[PDB]
Structure 1
Amino acid sequence: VVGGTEAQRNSWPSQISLQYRSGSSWAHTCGGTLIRQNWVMTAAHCVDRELTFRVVVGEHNLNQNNGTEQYVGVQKIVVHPYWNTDDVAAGYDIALLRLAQSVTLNSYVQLGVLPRAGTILANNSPCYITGWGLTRTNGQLAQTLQQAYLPTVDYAICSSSSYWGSTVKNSMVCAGGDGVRSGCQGDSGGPLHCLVNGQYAVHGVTSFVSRLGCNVTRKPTVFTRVSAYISWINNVIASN
């Protein structure tokens, strides 16, 4: 997250860190959202490669022991059937991971709330992006969980020539674009928490940003719209 501030360690309990084994050590690669004690929602492009993955819940500081972490392996990866690695702009950047074990819920580990199917947020709705991703374009990962205010930018506008144009679809949500705050490499798969009816629900899964840079004016961060996949999500967790 570029232009963010450290989050209180118990503000976003559904946030998880997706990591892969590099030889003998583990490295953070993406974010994700705990939606079931044994299910995690993330971006399909985060699990495109065939590597060994593990999920960490109740995490705050990646390099320090917080005394609240839970490490669990991933036994099943269900990528959306229409996902195409070479065409992220086509959408469908979403995947579901069945964890090898059910995590224990507590003050630092909670389930994220999903929106009602087909829900569209009004332009400029209040949302927050969270993650341990790059704090600067071509920079380095954040040690502590970062958060940033990132209001939505509706489709009509986001798909206009002055913004993303035809690269953005109605199955995506755009947020930010003030040239100061944004998601960045390492935040992918993470949540876009939006305040609706006095409650924060996960309306997006971080998908991509501009090739020019992370924080670019008129180039908001693009997210997979969760409300457009509610049926698919339930169908998967119902038969797996």
Structure 2
Amino acid sequence: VVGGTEAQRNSWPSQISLQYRSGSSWAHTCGGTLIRQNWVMTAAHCVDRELTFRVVVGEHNLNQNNGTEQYVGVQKIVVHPYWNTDDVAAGYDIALLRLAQSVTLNSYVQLGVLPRAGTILANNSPCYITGWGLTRTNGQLAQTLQQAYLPTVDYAICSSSSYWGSTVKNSMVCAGGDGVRSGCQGDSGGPLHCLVNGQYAVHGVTSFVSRLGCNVTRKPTVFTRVSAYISWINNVIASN
């Protein structure tokens, strides 16, 4: 997250860190959202490589024991049927990960609330992005979870010429674009939390930023719109 502030430990308990095995250690590569005790939602492009993956829930400082983490393996990866690696602008950047065991819920580990199917937010709706991604374009990862206030940019504005044009589709949510705050590499797969009827719900899965940089004016961070995929999500959990 560029232009973030550090999050409190218990503020976003459905956030997870998706990590892959890297020699004798594990390395953060993406975020995700815990949606069931044994299912995580993340972006399909985070699991394009055929690596060994684990999920860490109750995480706050990547490099330190916090006394709250649980570590669990990924047993099955279901990416969207229509995802295409060579075409992230087409959408469908979403995947669900079945965990090897069910995690224990507590004040640090909770399920993410999903929106109702079809829900579209009004422009400039209050949302927060969270993650351990780069804190500057071409910088390095954060050690502790960061958050940034990122209001939505609706489809009509985001698909206009000066913003993303044809690259953004209506299956996506745009948020931010002020040139200071944004998602960045390593935040991919993570939540966009938006306040709706006094409750935070996860309306986006972080998908992409500009090739020019993470925080670029009029190039808001782009998210997979979760409410376009509620039927698919529920069909996969009900049979896997």
Name segments (4+ residues, structure 1) moved above 4 Å: none
Task: Quote the offset at 1:200 in angstroms.
Answer: 0.1
Secondary structure of the 1:128 match is strand
Q: What's the Cα RMSD here?
A: 0.2
Equivalent runs, 1:4-43 vs 2, <5 Å: 4-43=4-43
Distance (Å, rounded) in 2 between the aligned partners of 1:190 and 1:53: 16
Report the TM-score, using the length of structure 2 for normalisation: 1.00
Aligned residue in 1 for 2:62: 62
Gaps of 5+ in 1: none
Task: Quote the offset at 1:14 in angstroms.
Answer: 0.1
Gaps of 5+ in 2: none
Secondary structure of the 1:45 match is helix
Aligned residue in 2 for 1:81: 81
Distance (Å, rounded) in 2 between the aligned partners of 1:162 and 1:24: 46
Once the two structures are superposed, what CA deviation does each residue of 1:37-61 show, in whole Å capped at 9, x if it has no partner? 0000000000011000000000000
Distance (Å, rounded) in 2 between the aligned partners of 1:23 and 1:78: 25
Once the two structures are superposed, what CA deviation does each residue of 1:45-86 show, in whole Å capped at 9, x if it has no partner? 000110000000000000000000000000000000000000
Distance (Å, rounded) in 1 between the aligned partners of 2:31 and 2:167: 23
Once the two structures are superposed, what CA deviation does each residue of 1:126-162 show, in whole Å capped at 9, x if it has no partner? 0000000000000000000000000000000000011
Task: Quote the offset at 1:23 in angstroms.
Answer: 1.4
Task: Quote the offset at 1:170 in angstroms.
Answer: 0.1
Distance (Å, rounded) in 1 between the aligned partners of 2:151 and 2:96: 26
Once the two structures are superposed, what CA deviation does each residue of 1:80-102 show, in whole Å capped at 9, x if it has no partner? 00000000000000000000000
Distance (Å, rounded) in 2 between the aligned partners of 1:74 and 1:28: 14
Distance (Å, rounded) in 2 between the aligned partners of 1:7 and 1:26: 23
* Aligned positions, number: 240
Once the two structures are superposed, what CA deviation does each residue of 1:12-35 show, in whole Å capped at 9, x if it has no partner? 000000000011110000000000
Aligned residue in 1 for 2:102: 102
Once the two structures are superposed, what CA deviation does each residue of 1:111-131 show, in whole Å capped at 9, x if it has no partner? 000000000000000000000
Task: Quote the offset at 1:182 in angstroms.
Answer: 0.2
Distance (Å, rounded) in 1 between the aligned partners of 2:40 and 2:28: 16
Secondary structure of the 2:223 match is strand
| Identity, % of aligned positions | 100
